């Protein structure tokens, strides 16, 4: 992000569907959109691989959002998480953090809070 006056301009823009014709917001929580961006202008991405690997994608989506007369249509097919590769793609697409750090002793002792991986899964 650039400025808090630009954040409201980005919040006014929405993406309508190409086939279903339904508008969807840009952020997961529009009320907490200001809490995601820092004061310097960097968003704390929940996915660590997307934050560490996609800086060119960050700059490209920033310069695409910087356009005035741009028309944004979203056609995203959701991936059903059954395999490990599909789990990784779902965690990247849904913008969530599944890496269990274990901040407390209850999260560190118990281990079934993660996602189960089948031993016959030869995806990755």
């Amino acid at each position: 992000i650039k400025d808090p006056a630009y954040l409201a301009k980005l919040l006014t823009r929405q993406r309508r569907h190409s086939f279903e014709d339904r508008e969807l917001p840009l952020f997961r929580d529009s009320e907490n959109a200001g809490q995601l961006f820092n004061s310097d202008g960097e968003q704390d991405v929940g996915n660590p691989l997307l934050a560490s690997w996609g800086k060119l994608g960050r700059d490209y989506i920033y310069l695409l959002s910087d356009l005035e007369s741009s028309q944004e249509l979203d056609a995203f097919v959701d991936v059903t998480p059954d395999n490990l590769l599909h789990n990784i793609q779902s965690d990247i697409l849904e913008l969530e953090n599944r890496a269990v750090a274990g901040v407390n002793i209850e999260e560190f002792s118990r281990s079934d809070n993660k996602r189960p991986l089948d031993p016959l899964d030869s995806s990755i």
Partner: protein, 62 residues
């Protein structure tokens, strides 16, 4: 691949959004290869040397 800068270029001192860099391009190519995998992903690297059986570390992305 880490590309050494020329040493007297002004773009390296002050970076912008639309600036080409080999490191960020490769780190985004790895992400695009992870996303573009539909069914099976097979990542292979040199973990052990063939000369003296020394331990070789993989990439930071892997």
């Amino acid at each position: 691949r880490q590309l050494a800068p020329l040493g007297f270029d002004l773009m390296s001192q002050k970076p912008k959004r639309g600036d080409r860099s080999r490191r960020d391009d490769d780190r985004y190519l790895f992400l695009e290869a992870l996303i573009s995998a539909q069914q099976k992903l097979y990542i292979s690297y040199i973990g052990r040397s063939i000369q003296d059986n020394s331990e070789r570390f993989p990439s930071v992305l892997v």
